[PDB]
Amino acid sequence: MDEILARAGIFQGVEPSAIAALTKQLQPVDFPRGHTVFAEGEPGDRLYIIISGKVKIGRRAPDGRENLLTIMGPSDMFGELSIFDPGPRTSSATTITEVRAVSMDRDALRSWIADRPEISEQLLRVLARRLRRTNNNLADLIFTDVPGRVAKQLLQLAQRFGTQEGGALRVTHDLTQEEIAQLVGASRETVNKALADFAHRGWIRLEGKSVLIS
Amino acid sequence: DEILARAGIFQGAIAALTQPVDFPRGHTVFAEGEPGDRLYIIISGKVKIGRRAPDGRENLLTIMGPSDMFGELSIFDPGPRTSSATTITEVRAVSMDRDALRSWIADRPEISEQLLRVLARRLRRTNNNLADLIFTDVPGRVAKQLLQLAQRFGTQEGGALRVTHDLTQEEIAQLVGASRETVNKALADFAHRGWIRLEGKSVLISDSERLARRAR
Numbered sequence A: 001m002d003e004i005l006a007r008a009g010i011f012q013g014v015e016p017s018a019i020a021a022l023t024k025q026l027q028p029v030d031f032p033r034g035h036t037v038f039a040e041g042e043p044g045d046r047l048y049i050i051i052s053g054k055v056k057i058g059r060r061a062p063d064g065r066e067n068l069l070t071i072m073g074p075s076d077m078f079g080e081l082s083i084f085d086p087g088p089r090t091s092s093a094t095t096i097t098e099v100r101a102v103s104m105d106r107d108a109l110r111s112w113i114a115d116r117p118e119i120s121e122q123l124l125r126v127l128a129r130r131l132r133r134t135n136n137n138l139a140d141l142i143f144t145d146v147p148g149r150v151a152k153q154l155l156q157l158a159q160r161f162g163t164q165e166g167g168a169l170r171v172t173h174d175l176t177q178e179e180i181a182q183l184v185g186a187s188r189e190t191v192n193k194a195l196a197d198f199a200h201r202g203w204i205r206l207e208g209k210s211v212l213i214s
Numbered sequence B: 001d002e003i004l005a006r007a008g009i010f011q012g013a014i015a016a017l018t019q020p021v022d023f024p025r026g027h028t029v030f031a032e033g034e035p036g037d038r039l040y041i042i043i044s045g046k047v048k049i050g051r052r053a054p055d056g057r058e059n060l061l062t063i064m065g066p067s068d069m070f071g072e073l074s075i076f077d078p079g080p081r082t083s084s085a086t087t088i089t090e091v092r093a094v095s096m097d098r099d100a101l102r103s104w105i106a107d108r109p110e111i112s113e114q115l116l117r118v119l120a121r122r123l124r125r126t127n128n129n130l131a132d133l134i135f136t137d138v139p140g141r142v143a144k145q146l147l148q149l150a151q152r153f154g155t156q157e158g159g160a161l162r163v164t165h166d167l168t169q170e171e172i173a174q175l176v177g178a179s180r181e182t183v184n185k186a187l188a189d190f191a192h193r194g195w196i197r198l199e200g201k202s203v204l205i206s207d208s209e210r211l212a213r214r215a216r
């Protein structure tokens, strides 16, 4: 779907015809659930745009667990930074569900802006505006306690993958209890202990297959 | 002269086409909120970049020395300065404005590739800090900060590399984003273990491997 692809942030503020000029040259790839798209340390020089599915972004923790950095879904990009500043990947990307995704490397990008200087300028604008959002995001997070930080992070994920259902956010998933444990990168006991606590304060109503967030 | 080459913009000569200025100690290059237009690359000296917390307290973001660049956001996303830039010590730097930079780009689109690298890299580092803030403990973060300061301002001195940063133990606490009480406990803990030596504005990192094993 061209619309899904065109919603990517790398296309924000770009002429639909220049977006299309790039899109047409890209063929979708099929990734199975639990598939490692790229691991930390591996050379990184391409970005992915998701059409369907969810992808986990994470880094290695001292104990050997993988910290849930973020979760990207449809229209979302991952690995986009390596297109501008390539090199060894500082994070890993792993499919949470079955994914269909589009890829593009630096050559593609350079060949794309090769004829379209207007795009370099807009990319700077979008990237720089994104840095300002991420900056005061950090600022906001710094001046908050430990639990408050994690809460904020989870809230942002809810706001992104949740449907507005009467002053609340519904996030419907198709994951088994073990997959949810793999997603967070924590014990299955630690997860259920945390979910039990959030529910206790009325922040979470846990129904089968879905979660209702305040 | 060789310092300019290490700058992010030129880290990718045709660069010789490169306004030099000298600032004194404690000089405020720009203030948080002022109209933001200029760009700055440091040749010699150190500059504190900070942003006020919601409570008014001045909070330290990053410390930058030679070959480092600050105030770039003002050129691409024009508007108020999001932060304040203060010179810790005497500083010699070169500046540029949006209209001056946009001209060099019109002539050579090659820089657009280097400019994007710099932004994309700042963006990545801010994302790493966000992950550290959540997944890395206070002592872990403290060690990680010292190790990052050593990469930029570290000179070997006998067995331990002396890392001069000219920062207060409270200013470090701001970099890490934790209470000064918890940060001080972490610093003393490292000192008592023989990992580091506290020298006022300087730190002697005796055991680098331990710190590295404490930051992961």
Ligand SMILES: Nc1ncnc2c1ncn2[C@@H]1O[C@@H]2COP(=O)(O)O[C@H]2[C@H]1O
Pocket: A001, A002, A003
């Ligand atoms: N999940 C899907 N199932 C079936 N058809 C689809 C799906 N996603 C996209 N398409 C079709 O593929 C087309 C791609 O271009 P359009 O987005 O214009 O319109 C899209 C639909 O016709």
